């Protein structure tokens, strides 16, 4: 039985070597949480992917923690989200939301997103001396963008700005997250009303129209969905941007490939998505098995058991990715699991990609001599929260 969480290595740029040790040895392992209880972790791409794709696993591992709230908004909402549903229930929702959350909407949103970035860089360029990229760019952009998509804007945004950061909270800070949540549930309750009697081209405007029409889609679901989207896409993207730049700056010979060559970027982004993970599980909530399961390597996972898809290392599996533990931004073959797989596959997978693309491009393009205001050594990740995020990222150029 192995101790999980693992040790957190010295560098922010390295991972627990314990991960590769397992993936290339026993591959499947059982683990114990402090807590005491026994779980299981899979490490192979095949296996990880099976866990997410196979329908004998369940994402209902928080179902009592949410009932045990419930009565807070936080808990009402853990019960109401996609990422926590299964079976038919999840299918109905995902289906309903995609009637408006489509690749097309997202594709068409790229131009705005470019401006949203340009603008934040326009403010970045009038701030003084070394400047923290986290506070001033990485944390704000994805909300802006989620706002633009939802139909919040654009007054209302210096308020939202508060509620949103409250949720960036270090996961222990429950009372302060519970507060913002509530402000948001009412805020969106209101926004609906106004969007209904003056729609525009945005996610909510569309959902209402669906909901008002001939469909079971209710205002509450819309609200849940709208927040689900925020929580899910905010911390996430914000962390990655910073991490990515760091990683690039760490590998200057791989970064030089993206200089003066903007068509190289979509590939670069997917390589970092692969190589630079959210967590060990790549932000994926542990699945628990609804029944017993046979794996690639022969091992069998028992029914009623917690399972950790360890995406962080499955995305370096040498069976799949040739030269996997090194960053190749030219990589053409790269079927990474950063956005998961199976029915829970990131709803914002394309959007994320666009944001990240647009962000790098703009930085490279407008601030190409961008160096860390020094140094790799001093960087430090956030104690809590859960996602691998930098506390700050002072940069100069």
What is the DSSP track for 231-290? Answer: HHHHHHHHHHHHHHHHHHHH-HHHHGGGTT-GGGHHHHHHHHHHHS-SSTTTT---EEES
Residue 250 among known ligand-binding residues: no
Q: By the 8 A CB rule, do 389 and 243 touch?
A: yes
Q: Which residues pair with 294 in a beta bridge?
A: 300
Residue 90 among known ligand-binding residues: yes
- Residues contacting ligand EFO: total by CB under 6 A: 17
> Burial letters for 320-351: b for 16+ Cβ neighbours within 10 Å, e otherwise?
bbeebeebbbebeebebbbbbbebbebbbebb
Residue 94 among known ligand-binding residues: yes
Q: By the 8 A CB rule, do 31 and 1 touch?
A: yes
Partner that binds at residue 346, options ligand HEM, ligand EFO, none, CB closer than 5 to 8 Å by kind = ligand HEM
Q: By the 8 A CB rule, do 42 and 30 touch?
A: no
Q: By the 8 A CB rule, do 355 and 142 touch?
A: yes
Which of residues 41 and 338 has its CB atom nearest to ligand HEM in the complex?
A: 338
Q: Does 397 bind ligand EFO (CB under 6 A)?
A: no
Residue 287 among known ligand-binding residues: yes
Residue among 234, 250, 240, 232 at smallest CA distance from 272: 240
Q: x/- string (CB under 6 A) for ligand HEM, residues 206-245?
A: ----------------------xx--xx--xx--x-----
> Residue 336 — left, alpha, or beta (φ > 0 → left; ψ -120 to 50 → alpha)?
beta
Q: Among 138, 231, 237, 315, indicate the residue that binds ligand EFO (CB under 6 A).
A: 231
Partner that binds at residue 347, options ligand EFO, ligand HEM, none, CB closer than 5 to 8 Å by kind = ligand HEM
What is the DSSP track for 68-102? Answer: HH-TTHHHHHHHH-STT--HHHHHHHHHHHHTTS-
Q: Among 3, 65, 193, 291, indicate the residue that binds ligand EFO (CB under 6 A).
A: 65
Partner that binds at residue 74, options ligand EFO, ligand HEM, none, CB closer than 5 to 8 Å by kind = ligand EFO
Q: Among 331, 336, 344, 388, indicate the residue that binds ligand HEM (CB under 6 A).
A: 344
Of residues 273-302, those binding ligand EFO (CB under 6 A): 279, 281, 283, 285-286
Q: Which residues pair with 222 in a beta bridge?
A: none
Of residues 76-105, those binding ligand HEM (CB under 6 A): 82-83, 94
Taking the alpha carbons of 358, 262, 322, 379 in that order, is the dihedral positive or negative? Answer: negative
Which of residues 45 and 177 has its CB atom nearest to ligand EFO in the complex?
A: 177
Binding region for ligand HEM (CB under 6 A) out of 10-18, 191-199, 258-266, 336-344: 336-344
Interaction site with ligand HEM (CB under 6 A): 52, 59, 82-83, 94, 228-229, 232-233, 236-237, 240, 278, 282-285, 338-340, 344, 346-348, 351-352
Interaction site with ligand EFO (CB under 6 A): 4-5, 33, 65, 74, 78, 171, 174, 177, 231-232, 279, 281, 283, 285-286, 386
């Amino acid at each position: 039985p192995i101790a999980f969480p693992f040790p957190d290595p010295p560098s922010v740029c390295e991972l627990p070597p314990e991960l590769a040790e397992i993936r290339d040895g026993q591959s499947v392992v059982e683990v114990k949480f402090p807590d005491g209880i026994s779980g299981w972790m899979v490490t192979k791409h095949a296996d990880v992917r099976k866990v997410l794709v196979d329908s004998r696993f369940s994402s209902k591992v928080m179902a009592t923690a949410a009932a045990a709230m419930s009565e807070t908004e936080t808990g009402k909402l853990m019960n109401e989200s996609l990422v926590g549903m299964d079976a038919p229930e999840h299918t109905r929702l995902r289906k309903l939301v995609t009637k408006a959350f489509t690749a097309r909407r997202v594709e068409t949103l790229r131009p705005r997103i470019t401006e949203l970035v340009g603008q934040l860089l326009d403010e970045l360029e009038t701030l003084p001396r070394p400047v923290d990229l986290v506070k001033n760019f990485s944390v704000p952009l994805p909300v802006r963008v989620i706002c633009e998509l939802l139909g919040v804007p654009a007054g209302d945004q210096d308020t939202f700005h508060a509620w949103s950061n409250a949720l960036l909270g270090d996961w222990q800070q429950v009372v302060e997250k519970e507060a913002a949540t509530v402000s948001l549930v009412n805020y969106f309750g209101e926004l609906i009303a106004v969007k209904r009697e003056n729609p525009a081209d945005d996610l909510i405007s569309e959902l209402i129209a669906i909901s008002d029409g001939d469909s079971t889609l209710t205002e509450r679901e819309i609200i849940a969905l709208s927040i689900g989207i925020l929580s899910a896409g905010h911390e996430t993207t914000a962390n990655q941007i910073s991490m990515f730049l760091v990683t690039l700056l760490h590998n200057p010979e791989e970064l030089d490939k993206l200089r003066d060559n903007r068509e190289a970027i979509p590939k670069a982004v997917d390589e970092l998505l692969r190589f630079v993970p959210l967590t060990t599980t790549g932000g994926i909530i542990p699945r628990l098995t609804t029944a017993e399961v046979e794996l690639s390597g022969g091992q069998v996972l028992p029914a009623g058991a917690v399972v950790l898809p360890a995406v962080a290392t499955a995305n370096r599996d040498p069976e799949v990715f040739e030269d996997g533990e090194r960053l190749n931004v030219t990589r053409e073959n790269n079927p990474h699991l950063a956005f998961g797989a199976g029915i829970h596959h990131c709803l914002g997978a394309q959007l994320a990609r666009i944001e990240l693309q647009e962000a790098l491009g703009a930085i490279l393009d407008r601030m190409p001599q961008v160096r860390l205001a020094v140094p790799e050594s001093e960087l430090r990740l956030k104690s809590a929260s859960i996602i691998r995020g930098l506390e700050s990222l002072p940069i100069t150029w």
